[PDB]
Design an enzyme around this catalytic site. Structure first.
Site: not given
Ligand code: HEM
Ligand SMILES: O=[N+]([O-])c1cccc2cn[nH]c12
Ligand code: HEM
Ligand SMILES: N=C(N)n1cc2cccc([N+](=O)[O-])c2n1
Ligand SMILES: N=C(N)n1cc2cccc([N+](=O)[O-])c2n1
Ligand SMILES: O=[N+]([O-])c1cccc2cn[nH]c12
Ligand SMILES: C[As](C)(=O)[O-]
Ligand SMILES: C[As](C)(=O)[O-]
Ligand SMILES: [Zn+2]
Lengths: 414, 416
Positions: B120, B123, B297
């Protein structure tokens, strides 16, 4: 033990059993993965502190020889057995041995074939190998390099090639090409602390001037070579201008792009890596193929620590460089890459775009899966620096491991 | 020098040593002979529904570890409250085979798990997570209520707030609470006769499960799927989300007027709902979380992956580009424009969103904070770097160390 490898675009699945042949360790452990690191702390070919254990070397030599005779289908034949004995006879008595021209040729092609970071490996079978082991002076090294360059360039119709200088020997200095590539642009550190030309070449440009080179002040001055014969201070040699083909960069539609005065050389010739074959190490083995457009248009021209030209092109394109959200950076990079492809195609000089290249890599993966049941690949290097998911390799899982023959990194000679 | 991985940033030439990885207690997929770092699903984490409760001892040490992390986070290690809580947890495991977390402990683990996610990029927001405790939930219908409150609070009329709702943990011999959908909000995948797929190809299976469980399908390219919620040992029940609760953004381009006519759109709330949340040995099989979208995304992956909406060629044709030759970079051109469209449409609609440039920059800052706060930060390079303009962002030039730390979010086998 055998890794299940999946492609998420086609649902296809394969198993990599070739990785079982790996006998050399990488930087990863079960506790943490370090595959994103560019260099090793010490996997790196550490300057032979003395002869390598006879057993160890003899072991690596036998596997190579075995690999060689399998290649020519005469495995287990008389020549094979007698060749293994010659090798054993030489290690036992001298503590090392020598390869035969054809063995060297085979070793080189396998080293390319085994490079996990190379996206152009489909061409692995087409490599002109120049045996330069008959070399005893830096001056001789310079003649070889000029021939390699002349042949490689071939007036714009590039042909992949490698030149192999004398292997390393116990207790004697290595033959070395101090430059990272046979052709690079000077990096002049100016008073204001800024840098004219290629920032990544400040140090090397220094060493050159240090050894008597008369520096220019241009942004694209071809650097001279610092060739080093064993235990002798490196010597300075200037590359004949006509031998160094360059491509003036212009843009298909944007008239002003040319006014920028940008340009790049045709020949990407890595010269600082070590070639290891059957335990033998070659500290000077410059090689070259041809450029993939992104390396020039994205990495060399757009890296922040390189020519860093994004904003200029962006301002010339009259883009809102006020906020990241306008994607001004992404837009300028595409045009810079387009200019390179356009220009190189205009100068009738070999080049390949990242889409064409990765498509070919996909095919190579299949040929290798059938040919050896696997292919070591480093995903972070195979996927281009722009439009990653827009290419097929992005959606293809990969197993990374070290096979020998191999190309390795070594310490800077200074 | 130090017996820890040396990490370098090639743009700034700076060095750091990750000593945090030393705290890892979960093995990854790599070995000294080969790197499997590029694999999406490493059969490691994949918390396969273990028949019985973890070995009382395997769980005990895990729990002991988590409690220690909690008391350290509140600067009370070795305190009377700490050794008591330790005695409390063990006593409980001794009489029931498992144990329960205190409210604050759950809040702490939930945040840590996000904080620990190697993949992620967002973070830097970890400390700001609204944790909804829903461990009292006893029915699929109640799960529906919680999920709807989550969507309501999380969406917040466009000003998105990160959140996670935690349902009852896994209990010794007693069905799991599960959300069958991979995300609380996703578009249906309609299998066609010619063989193609109408909508989102990624969701053909889930769509066909909703239908078989009673869903009356639609026939659009952007139909919101109903939820398939599952209470312990009961068959999953179907639930349709009240349209007003599902905020969506029609997509349009700032200068290419015809773009809007493509009728493309996307939902505002990204809510992963199929991951298992593990804290101190306890397993929360249902605990959907959400934050907000990073533009790539939507614009690059969902809209441009060949196995998804695959809209690259259409847009290129509309842009009048040469889709007959790779060297025209028509894919690169269309992708940039589609991505700009996503950023433009969300802003116009006042719905929170972040471009890959701003996001990656904030992540670099986040890496700096963690270097000082924990001596490192587990990160998956192939997932931190955006799917487009890779080396144009600062993270591309930053080496990273990947390792598993718990609390954590893990992938889990599909309930069916
Ligand atoms: C604040 C906004 C957030 C953004 C912009 C964000 C963005 C991202 C992005 C870009 C990815 C990877 C996408 C990819 O390459 O396929 C990701 C993966 C992930 N995020 Fe975040 N995230 C956010 C919030 C969160 C929250 C609130 C949690 C959990 C409480 C979280 C948990 C994770 C996890 C566990 C993954 C990995 C999922 C996987 O392995 O497929 N994210 N996030
Ligand atoms: O691309 N994202 O913004 C994204 C991807 C995967 C998980 C979460 C959770 N918030 N944003 C996420
Ligand atoms: C035919 C044209 C060729 C093309 C288009 C090509 C392209 C590439 C590219 C794009 C990279 C990665 C650059 C990066 O991401 O930073 C690479 C790396 C590499 N290539 Fe090739 N390659 C070609 C020929 C060769 C040849 C002839 C050899 C060797 C005989 C070779 C050996 C390697 C090695 C060893 C690496 C990794 C170097 C490093 O670690 O920095 N390549 N190649
Ligand atoms: N950013 C990501 N989601 N991805 C990072 C990856 C690394 C290797 C393979 C992948 N595949 O196949 O999708 C991948 N996706
Ligand atoms: N394809 C590549 N050249 N690179 C792949 C990489 C993976 C991690 C860090 C890198 N840095 O820092 O340059 C990197 N460069
Ligand atoms: O980009 N390249 O074309 C490239 C990069 C690195 C090494 C070689 C060798 N031939 N081409 C290369
Ligand atoms: C050269 As233009 C501004
Ligand atoms: C729809 As456009 C051409
Ligand atoms: Zn690894």
């Amino acid at each position: 033990k055998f890794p299940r490898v999946k492609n998420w675009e086609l649902g296809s699945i394969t198993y990599d059993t070739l990785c079982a042949q790996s006998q050399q360790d990488g930087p990863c452990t079960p506790r943490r993965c370090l595959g994103s690191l560019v260099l090793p702390r010490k996997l790196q070919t550490r300057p032979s502190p003395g002869p390598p254990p006879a057993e160890q070397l003899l072991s690596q030599a036998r596997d190579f020889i075995n690999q060689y005779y399998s290649s020519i289908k005469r495995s287990g034949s008389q020549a094979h057995e007698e060749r293994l004995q010659e090798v054993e006879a030489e290690v036992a008595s001298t503590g090392t041995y020598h390869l035969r021209e054809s063995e060297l040729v085979f070793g080189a092609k396998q080293a390319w074939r085994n490079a996990p970071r190379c996206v152009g490996r489909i061409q692995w079978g087409k490599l002109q190998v120049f045996d330069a082991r008959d070399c005893s002076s830096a001056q001789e090294m310079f003649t070889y390099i000029c021939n390699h360059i002349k042949y490689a360039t071939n007036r714009g119709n590039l042909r992949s090639a490698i030149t192999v200088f004398p292997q390393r020997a116990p207790g004697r200095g290595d033959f070395r090409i101090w430059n990272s590539q046979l052709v690079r642009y000077a990096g002049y550190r100016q008073q204001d602390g800024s840098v004219r030309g290629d920032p990544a070449n400040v140090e090397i440009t220094e060493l050159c001037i240090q050894h008597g080179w008369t520096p220019g002040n241009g942004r694209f001055d071809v650097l001279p070579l610092l060739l080093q014969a064993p235990d002798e201070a490196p010597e300075l040699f200037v590359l004949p201008p006509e031998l160094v083909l360059e491509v003036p960069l212009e843009h298909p539609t944007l008239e002003w792009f040319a006014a920028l005065g940008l340009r790049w050389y045709a020949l990407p010739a890595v010269s600082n890596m070590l070639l290891e074959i059957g335990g033998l190490e070659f500290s000077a083995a410059p090689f070259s193929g041809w450029y993939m457009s992104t390396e020039i248009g994205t990495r060399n021209l757009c890296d922040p620590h390189r020519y860093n030209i994004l904003e200029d092109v962006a301002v010339c394109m009259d883009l809102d460089t006020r906020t990241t959200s306008s994607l001004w950076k992404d837009k300028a990079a595409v045009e810079i890459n387009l200019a390179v492809l356009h220009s190189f195609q205009l100068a009738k000089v070999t080049i390949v775009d990242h889409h064409a290249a990765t498509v070919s890599f996909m095919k190579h993966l299949d040929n290798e899966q059938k040919a050896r049941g696997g292919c070591p690949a480093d995903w972070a290097w195979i996927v281009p620096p722009i439009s990653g998911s827009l290419t097929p390799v992005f959606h293809q899982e990969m197993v990374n491991y070290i096979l020998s023959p191999a190309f390795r990194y070594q310490p800077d000679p200074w």
